[PDB]
Amino acid sequence: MNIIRKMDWDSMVHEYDLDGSRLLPWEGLNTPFGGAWCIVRPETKSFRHSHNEYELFIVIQGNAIIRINDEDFPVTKGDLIIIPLDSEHHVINNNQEDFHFYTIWWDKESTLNFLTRLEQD
Template structure:
C-alpha cells in the first residue's frame, strides 16, 4: 500500500492556484493520465490557460465561476465540468472567505499518446517473438 499524506504533500502555486499533483506518482505509478487537487484562494482565479489534453474538474468544496472559451457557469460542490482540448479556461473563486477546491483529471496529451504507442509496440514485438519460438 502506498499513501500520500496531505501533511507531507508537495503543493506548489501553479496556474493561479495551490496545486498538489497526485498522478503520475514518482517511483510508484506512471499512468497515461494525470490528476491533481487544486485550491483557489478566496477571491482569486486560476490563470486563463489552455493545453493540448482533455481535462475534467470535479468540485470538492466551495463555489466558483468556470469560464471555458466564451461559456460561463457557476459551479459548486459535486459539480463536474469537461474541458475540451485547446479551450482557454479559468476558474474563479467567488467566496471572500472559503477556498474553492477541485480535483482535476487530464488525459490524452501528445506525450501520453506516444507512451501508449510505445507500450502497444513493445507488446506487439513480444508477441511476434513468442510466435516465432
C-alpha cells in the same frame, strides 16, 4: 511503491495562480493521465490557458465559476466539468472559502506512454 500519500497542504506548489498538489511523480505508479488537487484561494482567480490535452475537473468543495471561452459555469461539490480541447479556461472564486477541485488530464502521448511503460516492465 507507496500506497498512500497523505496530503500536506503546506507542500502545495503555487502555479497557474492557484495552489496545487500534483499526482506525479509517484514512484511505481503508472497512469495514462496526469492529475492535481487544486485550490483557488478566497477572492482569487486562476491563470487562463488552453491546450490540446483532454481535461476533467471534479469539484470537491466550495463554490466557483468556471469560465470556458467566455461562457460561465457555476459549480460546487460533486459537479464535473469537461474542458473542451483548446478552449480557454480558468476558475473564479469570488467567495470567502477555499475552492477545491481535482483535475485529470490526458492525451495520446500520456496514454501511449502508459502502455509503453507497462510493456517495458
